[PDB]
Amino acid sequence: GPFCGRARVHTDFTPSPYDTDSLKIKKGDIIDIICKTPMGMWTGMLNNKVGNFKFIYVDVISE
Helix, strand or coil: CCCCCCCCCCCCCCCCCCCCCCCCCCCCCCCEEEECCCCCCCEEEEEEEEEEHHHHHHECCCC
């Protein structure tokens, strides 16, 4: 059911300055999908930094 590959950010999503539990992403940036969270948020890696991000701000594309 679930699809794995590359995730393209379509919406600029940035956590608060005191928020480190969330990964930082930017529109146009590509994040490698490694796992999905039951809640809905997707997990990926960015600049040797793995974390969770809002899927609503990220679109799944095929590379």
